[PDB]
Symmetry: C3
């Protein structure tokens, strides 16, 4: 009798909970996408500036520090799927 009504009501309550958790897991999955994207933007923004200076008539020492700096920055960025713009040397 009352055991079975209770069992089914448990099951609904747990379902709702799993709904809540799953909804948090998908948001934790969006955020981790948002973090990757933030990193990708900063990465492209910083290389974008470096390459703008590199393609100009800048002194030879600043070219050394900027190339080196491009690697360090690029090293810190573990590995995201970057796609730096075509470039523009001529």
């Amino acid at each position: 009798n009352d055991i079975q009504i209770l069992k089914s009501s448990i099951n609904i309550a747990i379902e709702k909970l799993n709904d809540r958790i799953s909804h948090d897991e998908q948001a934790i999955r969006d955020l981790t996408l948002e973090i990757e994207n933030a990193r990708s933007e900063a990465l492209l923004g910083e290389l974008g500036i470096i390459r703008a200076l590199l393609v100009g008539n800048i002194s030879i020492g600043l070219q050394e520090s900027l190339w080196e700096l491009a690697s360090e920055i690029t090293n810190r960025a573990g590995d995201l799927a970057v796609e730096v713009s075509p470039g523009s040397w001529i």
Copy 2:
């Protein structure tokens, strides 16, 4: 008898769970705030550098690449509520 004691104890246990989930949802909400802020900082940091170069005596080609670069960066930043500093052209 023992059905009712069991029902109330279920209800407490579920409450605690919903407490845990709600506490995760508020942290997922802080992080999404933290991500926006990280993006805003990188955005302001990169425009800050670009505008420092733009207001100086830099070559005319570097000015072209930097203005263009300011848009691309600003385009990648979907739309955050930016507030770039007043500027400083004179």
Copy 3:
């Protein structure tokens, strides 16, 4: 009789749920680590560019705007445990 079988089955179901939540909490903890790291990278990338310009033969006004800019950027970065490279002024 059937009350006790039901009680134990509740306990397993709740355990599984707490497992799920705890697994979300550790991921919310990784993301908050990932956000800090994204901020640290952008921070180092932007100071890296600024210091490359600062150590060169740049005009005196651009040096003013860049030093100032280094503080504003560094101020916006609440306080992360930064570790800017040794520097390189000579």
